[PDB]
Design a protein around this ligand. Structure first.
Ligand SMILES: Cc1cn([C@H]2C[C@H](O)[C@@H](COP(=O)(O)OP(=O)(O)OP(=O)(O)O)O2)c(=O)[nH]c1=O
Ligand SMILES: [Ca+2]
Ligand SMILES: [Ca+2]
Ligand SMILES: [Ca+2]
Ligand SMILES: [Ca+2]
Ligand SMILES: [Ca+2]
Ligand SMILES: [Ca+2]
Ligand code: NA
Ligand code: NA
Length: 902
DNA sequence: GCGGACTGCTTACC
């Protein structure tokens, strides 16, 4: 096989590289890299290098890397540009690996670990590291083993060895329910004392030095605590053994009171899974405890234990260790589903960066573009200092707040990247400019054709139609990867519905789940068998179909993020190719493209459906149009339909065979208008919404911009077994909205759209009645908690103190001085509850860390003074009033003169 | 007292 790097670092005039050789062995080489930078030279001076603009450049080799840096600084003083890749690690990887990297992940040592630190002094600050580490579970992906380091003797209690026999038993058997599939992969190691533990961990660390280091909050807690604990005990020199190059860097962001440190272990790529999750999951959770996320992602039970964590080791050391092992495994399970590690490796080796740089799309694109330009023997420009400037973006149509029975939406495939490719927008493809007419002139085609020679954007920019651009070239390749993975995803979704249909007629028999590749559509042979299988087989297949879809989702939605982030990078002053001319060219073209096709779609419908002058497009956001399909249905009449599935098939056929061609013609013309390089405005049909046939449901409604709900039957080819609700922006979709209210509001909407007003009022009356019996957690609001100290004036709310921040200050007073009572962490999210007047807490509300039960110290008191009617009004009533008034409905039966009867 | 205009904060949707 071909060789591939693992981690690269720059230390002085040396580059430290860990890599896998052509035989598969992990090695480490120190290279005194001689980097080359460039400078402009006379046109006379013959050369092989030219900048992206065609200006000749002379290559300049350097004795070492510090020399290349001192030269960059000297060129600045002179006021001349120093071209080339300034980040020498990237240039080295580019040189050393001048080919597409095919990596073997089984050769990459990915390490998952978690530590336990017992502390009566509240949360054990990693900077201080004053409490003994009493447990470490460390999973190694090469060995496929869980290495457990267990401290039996501590100043905070002496315990017996942990039993793997008891750990394997069910909770109900007094066991700990460690998953049986890892029982044989656990390697247990007890220790007489902490020094022996920590020293044995260090030697284990060296024999199996992790390349990728992940876990839950390992960067924020585990890593800095282990580093600082070892430093306090064995001195810094030993604490540096965590780095394979013995070099670490302690970045200080102490954050007011206390000390927060950002420890960087050179030679190791740390990918904290909480950071991978926040960037790549595309969810917003009310809590980010591993327990909460595990339950959300895996549908597993919450790791239950009796007392506080600070006493779990002494009271139940057996469970203490078991939960530490399980926690490590939980992250592995989440990754097996989400596959963020795999995505990071993909993006990492594709771009040729340090793996941990996948968090930075700008670094990612800097490397991709640089490597692309390096092959054509081209020299990249120098990064410049730019001032930030506010510039506009997408167009959002203001909707008329109302109900909408039949709705059909259309969306443009990868809008902004397509625009980049269509117009050939790139730093080096700029041809010139032109005098612009107001945007509506181009939209209405009243303006004059900008150019007959170049590709144009209505922001005034012109680009070459015949030259290939680095940005369009590289964005196209990643986009092609995205289209591939989305196809796999959607096929699994289509197969997902197929299983859900067969689950209506399960076949009582003992069978095994069929061996199919869910990334591809089911064959007729496989389809036929599906309707002849049991429930044990079908439900297992539904699981695998969804795991395939999730794997496809991760792959497609994050390559989508990467390419959209390239557009965004063009508007960031830290990007090497920052250029508002290009950034605006994208957005302004985008604004034109949308409102152009709004007019074109209106015209095609007004005549072909008779009534001319009526607005069919009711809403639009950036690149979508929501078409009112009432008149389309009425032109045939609803009577000519067998069932709901019939007219859904009808519109599906109507949009596919009639609408889309007209839209294509509209974008063919616009492409010609702007004289673009290639037509790539592909608007396919999105959703098909409407009430079930012959029902009293309203189908859908809008309350305003980015706030609507639709009863959808088909979405991008996928025909749902049961109609799925498409809700955007409404309170049901916000993490700040309490769980029970999310359900209640959603059920209100479902009835609103599917069943009608009468059903809504029936469910409303019932919910209001039983509302007060809901668990307090499920009806607590959620909010991020920033700048707490900023609003903390002597334990009391300062001026303009936010509601939730007020709730926190109330909480701090209620648990004053009482250590071991959980503290609210600056930046994390909190649950919020209103309090009735005259409560002993002395404030409008209270707040405590989300994902947790409020401390027993005050829990019983809080449950009493909960203001239910306030919760009902603010969180449930008020948003529901918004929905109903907009759709012109009532959640409560109004008073009539008929009320005078019995 | 209390609603309307404004601002800070949070969280959604492209
Ligand atoms: C979601 C999102 C969109 N956008 C911009 C660029 C997108 O082209 C435009 C529309 O995004 P979307 O229409 O939501 O998705 P997409 O068009 O990019 O690709 P597809 O629809 O096939 O899934 O909005 C961003 O800049 N950043 C984002 O995070
Ligand atoms: Ca723990
Ligand atoms: Ca159980
Ligand atoms: Ca000993
Ligand atoms: Ca789109
Ligand atoms: Ca869209
Ligand atoms: Ca099409
Ligand atoms: Na972090
Ligand atoms: Na069947």
């Amino acid at each position: 096989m071909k060789e591939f790097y693992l981690t690269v670092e720059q230390i002085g005039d040396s580059i430290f590289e860990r890599y896998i050789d052509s035989n598969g062995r992990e090695r480490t080489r120190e290279v005194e890299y001689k980097p080359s930078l460039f400078a402009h030279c006379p046109e006379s001076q013959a050369t092989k290098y030219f900048d992206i603009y065609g200006k000749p450049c002379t290559r300049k080799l350097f004795a070492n890397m510090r020399d290349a840096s001192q030269w960059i600084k000297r060129m600045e003083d002179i006021g001349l540009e120093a071209l080339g890749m300034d980040d020498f690690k990237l240039a080295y990887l580019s040189d050393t690996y001048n080919y597409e990297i095919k990596y073997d992940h089984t050769k990459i040592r990915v390490a998952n670990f978690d530590i336990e630190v017992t502390s009566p002094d509240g949360f054990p600050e990693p900077s201080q590291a004053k409490h003994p580490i009493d447990a470490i579970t460390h999973y190694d992906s090469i060995d496929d083993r869980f290495y457990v380091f267990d401290l039996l003797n501590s100043p905070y209690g002496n315990v017996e060895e942990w039993s793997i026999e008891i750990a394997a038993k069910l909770q109900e058997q007094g066991g700990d329910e460690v998953p049986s599939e890892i029982i044989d992969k656990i390697i247990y190691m007890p220790f007489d004392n902490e020094k022996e533990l920590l020293m044995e961990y260090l030697n284990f660390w060296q024999q199996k030095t992790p390349v990728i280091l992940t876990g839950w909050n390992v960067e924020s807690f585990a890593i800095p605590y282990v580093y600082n604990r070892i430093k306090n005990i064995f001195g810094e020199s030993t604490a540096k053994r965590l780095s394979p190059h013995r070099k670490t860097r302690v970045k200080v962001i102490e954050n007011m009171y206390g000390s927060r440190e950002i420890i960087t272990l050179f030679g190791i790529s740390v990918l904290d899974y909480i950071d991978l999750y926040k960037k790549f999951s595309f969810t917003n959770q009310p809590s980010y405890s591993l327990d909460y996320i595990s339950e959300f992602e895996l549908n597993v039970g919450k790791l239950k234990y009796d007392g506080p964590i600070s006493k779990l080791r002494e009271s139940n050391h057996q469970r203490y260790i078991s939960y530490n092992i399980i926690a490590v495994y939980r992250v592995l399970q989440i990754d097996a589903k989400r596959q963020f590690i795999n995505l990071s490796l993909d993006m990492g080796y594709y771009a040729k960066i340090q793996i941990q740089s996948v968090f930075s799309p700008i670094k990612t694109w800097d490397a991709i573009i640089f490597n692309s330009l390096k092959e054509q023997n081209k020299v990249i420009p120098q990064g410049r200092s730019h001032p930030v400037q506010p510039y506009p973006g997408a167009f959002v149509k203001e909707p008329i707040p109302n109900r909408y029975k039949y709705v059909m939406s259309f969306d443009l495939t990868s809008f902004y990247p397509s625009i980049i490719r269509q117009v050939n927008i790139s730093p080096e493809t700029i041809a010139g400019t032109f005098k612009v007419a107001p945007l509506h002139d181009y939209i209405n085609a009243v303006a004059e054709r900008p150019s007959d020679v170049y590709s144009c954007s209505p922001n005034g920019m012109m680009y070459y139609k015949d030259r290939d651009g680095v940005v369009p070239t590289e964005i196209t390749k990643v986009f092609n990867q995205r289209k591939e993975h989305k196809g796999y995803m959607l096929a699994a979704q289509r197969n997902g519905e197929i299983i859900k249909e067969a689950l209506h007629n399960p076949n009582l028999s003992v069978d095994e789940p069929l061996d199919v590749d869910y990334r591809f559509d089911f064959s007729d042979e496989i389809k036929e068998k599906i309707k002849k299988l049991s429930a044990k087989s079908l439900n297992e297949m539904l699981f695998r179909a969804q795991r395939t879809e999730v794997a496809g989702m991760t792959a497609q939605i994050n390559r989508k993020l990467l390419i959209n982030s390239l557009y965004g990078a063009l508007g960031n002053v830290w990007f090497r190719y920052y250029d508002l001319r290009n950034a605006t060219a994208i957005t302004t073209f985008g604004q034109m493209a949308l409102q152009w096709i709004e007019r074109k779609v209106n015209e095609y419908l007004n005549e072909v459906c008779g009534t001319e002058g009526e607005a069919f497009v009711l809403y639009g956001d950036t690149d979508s149009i929501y078409v009112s399909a009432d008149k389309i249905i009425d032109k045939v009449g609803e009577s000519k339909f067998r069932d709901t599935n019939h007219w859904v098939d009808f519109l599906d056929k109507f949009a596919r065979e009639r609408m889309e061609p007209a839209i294509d013609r509209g974008f063919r013309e616009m492409c010609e208008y702007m004289n673009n390089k290639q037509h790539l405005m592909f608007m396919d049909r999105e959703a098909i919404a409407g009430p079930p046939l012959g029902s009293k449901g309203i189908g859908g409604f809008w309350t305003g911009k980015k706030r609507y709900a639709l009863n959808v039957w088909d979405m991008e080819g996928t025909r749902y077994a049961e109609p799925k609700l498409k809700i955007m922006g409404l309170e049901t979709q916000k993490s700040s909205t309490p769980k029970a209210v999310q359900k209640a509001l959603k059920e209100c909407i479902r009835r609103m759209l599917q069943e009608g007003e009468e059903s809504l009022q029936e469910y409303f009356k019932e919910f209001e009645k039983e509302f007060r019996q809901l668990n307090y957690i499920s009806i607590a609001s959620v909010s991020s908690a920033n700048n707490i100290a900023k609003y903390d004036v002597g334990g009391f709310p300062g001026p303009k103190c936010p509601f939730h921040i007020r709730g926190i200050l109330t909480y701090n007073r209620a648990i004053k001085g009482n250590i071991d009572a959980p503290q609210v962490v600056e930046g994390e999210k909190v649950y919020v509850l209103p309090l009735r007047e005259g409560n002993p807490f002395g404030d409008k509300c209270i707040a405590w860390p989300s994902g947790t039960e409020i401390t027993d110290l005050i829990k019983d008191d809080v449950l009493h003074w909960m203001d239910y009617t306030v919760l009902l009004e603010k969180t449930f009533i008020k948003p529901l009033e918004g929905f109903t008034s907009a759709a012109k409905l009532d959640y409560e039966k109004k008073a009539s003169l008929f009320d005078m009867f019995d």
